[PDB]
């Protein structure tokens, strides 16, 4: 809900040399369309020697999840910048949408590597379709036969300040 996946399609402005410049597409994870077009131009100015002023955005479209109530495992490839250098890394997430997995990834890199949103490039997000593709044991352990587990030590949230009965944590 923090993010949406967009396609952004753009091209160079037509000139006399090139009447039909080549259309390019990027898949962008952004809070809204303004940021989506900003990110598109950011990556186009890195990858190619183009500017925003000599180009134009052709289309911006939400890409909805195909199966929003199917449980999936995603692999995400990332380029991020640390305090010290620049690194590549690959992590796995379980979710029902690509946007949910991307949001969890942003939280996770903020938590473990102190990587802010500006420091991260999303190389690729892929639904892992075979259980053999799942490489990380922190997600693999939820892919075993007849998984069941309790939730020991339940803490009930109280509306009142003072309770007349002793606490329990059974569940």
């Amino acid at each position: 809900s923090r993010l949406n996946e967009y396609q952004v399609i753009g091209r160079n402005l037509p000139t006399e040399s090139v009447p039909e410049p080549k259309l390019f597409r990027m898949r962008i994870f952004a809070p809204n369309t303004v940021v989506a077009k900003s990110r598109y131009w950011y990556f186009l100015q890195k990858l190619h020697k183009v500017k925003k002023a000599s180009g134009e955005i052709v289309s911006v479209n939400i890409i909805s999840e195909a199966k929003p109530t199917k449980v999936k495992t995603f692999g995400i490839w990332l380029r991020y910048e640390s305090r010290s250098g620049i690194h590549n890394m690959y992590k796995e997430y379980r979710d029902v949408t690509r946007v949910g997995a991307v949001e969890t990834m942003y939280q996770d890199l903020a938590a473990r590597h102190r990587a802010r949103f500006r420091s991260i490039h999303i190389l690729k997000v892929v639904e892992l379709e075979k259980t053999d593709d799942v490489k990380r044991q922190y997600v693999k352990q939820f892919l075993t036969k007849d998984l069941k587990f309790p939730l020991p030590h339940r803490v009930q949230k109280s509306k009142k300040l003072f309770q007349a009965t002793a606490p329990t944590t059974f569940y």
């Binding site: 030590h153 109280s158 300040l161 003072f162 007349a164 606490p167």
Partner: protein, 199 residues
């Protein structure tokens, strides 16, 4: 959430600072509070660390005259009192009047041994701390820094618990008899008609 005449909190298993903040706001808003069993309070962190903290507190004293310095009270109820007074504007008349609404005790002295005691879930150790974290019992910490009455309080609490258990056995027997009597009068006209009302 209701306005009570006096709220009597059982201090056993409550974290010092969380209970202190809740009590401070209660007394500032005009509610009389009594906290009992202050030796059963808890502080998060291992015992040795809280002992070190108390010794760092002891180190502070007026150089030119120790009699003017901070007064380091050792009893557990006074440790809770120090935590509470730090959360009160105690140098104003309103703060003093708020602190007059508070009472704190080791053990459960009369008349509070025959009165209902409540708990504060937002401050309960078993509900707040992560299950593997170490904690301190304020009664042990007080005894380590000069409180003299751990064993007296323990003996008196044992006696109170014997008396209270006998009280409870009688109340349980009476309640069983009353439940039998109300079961004898079920499926009555009044019983059915009350059942139609959710009662």
């Amino acid at each position: 959430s209701s306005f009570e005449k006096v709220v009597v909190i059982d201090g056993k298993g409550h974290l010092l600072g969380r209970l202190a903040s809740i009590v401070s706001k209660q007394i500032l808003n005009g509610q009389k509070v009594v906290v009992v069993r202050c030796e059963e309070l808890n502080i998060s962190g291992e015992f040795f660390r809280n002992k070190l903290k108390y010794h760092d507190y002891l180190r502070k004293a007026t150089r030119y005259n120790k009699k003017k310095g901070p007064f380091h009270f050792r009893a557990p109820s006074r440790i809770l009192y120090k935590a509470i007074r730090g959360m009160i504007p105690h140098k104003t008349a309103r703060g003093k009047a708020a602190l007059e609404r508070l009472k704190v005790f080791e053990g459960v002295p009369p008349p509070y041994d025959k009165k209902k005691r409540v708990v504060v879930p937002q401050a309960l150790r078993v509900l707040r701390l992560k299950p593997g974290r170490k904690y301190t019992t304020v009664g042990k910490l007080s005894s380590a820094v000069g409180w003299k009455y751990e064993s007296v309080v323990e003996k008196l609490e044992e006696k109170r618990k014997v008396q209270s258990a006998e009280y409870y056995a009688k109340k349980k027997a009476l309640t069983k008899k009353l439940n039998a009597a109300k079961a004898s009068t079920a499926e009555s006209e009044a019983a059915q008609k009350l059942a139609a009302f959710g009662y």
